[PDB]
């Protein structure tokens, strides 16, 4: 079955500017500006109402209709990123060797870098380079905690996943060795 018309709607707050040109969405708000190329999905954008974006597919199959939900959630996440931001709080715990985490800003690349030392007594220094736009802060309120803040949910969550996956225990019982860095809390900055 091919459905003749299928539509989704996105409400837009007052402080958001959305510019779509050849399926390239540019969302700018108080915190910053994000861009995303959605040209790989056949979709027609329109202004159905004031502050309302309309997404429509004509003569599409069920897969083509279902793709609009992904596009809707992507644009909504961009709007939430430029309005409230995204914040991932991570906690690093240890049993015997205290894990040392250093955060600096590589200014030549314009991006933050995290150096992890003494992970279960290893002499190697693990290094994680952040995606641009993600800011790393060692939390002063709680103990042994990083905070990743940004406008791009994909960038912040991918940086968090990189920090988890660079600290993995190998050739040991994971029931006994609980060392590592884990994402404790996910939420919005504001």
């Amino acid at each position: 079955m091919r459905y003749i018309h299928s539509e989704e709607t996105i409400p837009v707050p007052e402080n958001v500017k959305v510019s779509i040109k050849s399926r390239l969405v540019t969302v700018e708000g108080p915190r910053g500006k994000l861009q995303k190329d959605l040209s790989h999905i056949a979709v027609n954008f329109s202004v159905v109402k004031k502050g309302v974006i309309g997404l429509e597919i004509h003569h599409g199959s069920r897969k083509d209709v279902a793709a609009l939900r992904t596009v809707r959630t992507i644009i909504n996440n961009m709007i939430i990123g430029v309005t409230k931001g995204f914040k991932y709080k991570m906690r690093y715990v240890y049993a015997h060797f205290p894990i040392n985490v250093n955060v600096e800003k590589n200014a030549e690349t314009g991006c933050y870098e995290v150096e992890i030392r003494n992970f279960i007594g290893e002499k190697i220094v693990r290094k994680v380079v952040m995606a641009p736009g993600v800011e790393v802060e060692i939390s002063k309120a709680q103990k042994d905690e990083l905070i990743l803040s940004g406008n791009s949910l994909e960038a912040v969550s991918q940086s968090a996943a990189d920090i988890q996956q660079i600290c993995k225990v190998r050739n040991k019982d994971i029931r006994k060795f609980l060392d590592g860095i884990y994402v404790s809390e996910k939420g919005n900055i504001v």
Binding site: V18, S19, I20, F45, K50
Partner: protein
Amino acid sequence: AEINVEATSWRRVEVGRVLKLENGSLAAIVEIIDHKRVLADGPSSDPKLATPRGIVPLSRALLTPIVIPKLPRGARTGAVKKAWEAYGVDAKWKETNWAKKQLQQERRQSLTDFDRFKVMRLKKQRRFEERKALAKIKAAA
């Protein structure tokens, strides 16, 4: 909440939309059968633009920018003809650039050998003044 979205704007097949068939005639859509076939009637006084009532495939039809306003769905030939002469579809079609191109094509294919020779000579005579004007423009600026 100001939003700047520019996108494509297709013409829409609907009740009242005028199609131009492959043979050059015109029809108005009165009923949509499916996404590939429509029911259309061309009740025009001009025999070149006239079309009998019947099924028109959308692959052999083109969407013209003329839409008959408030054409009832499934209207028969008398009602479609009344709406046609009321809205003046023939004059608007003659005004559109598609009919001008079709008329130009017919005028070019209706030429004889003497006609082509005269076209050549008159085009050279006009080209002389055009070349003089172009030379003056290029010399001035």
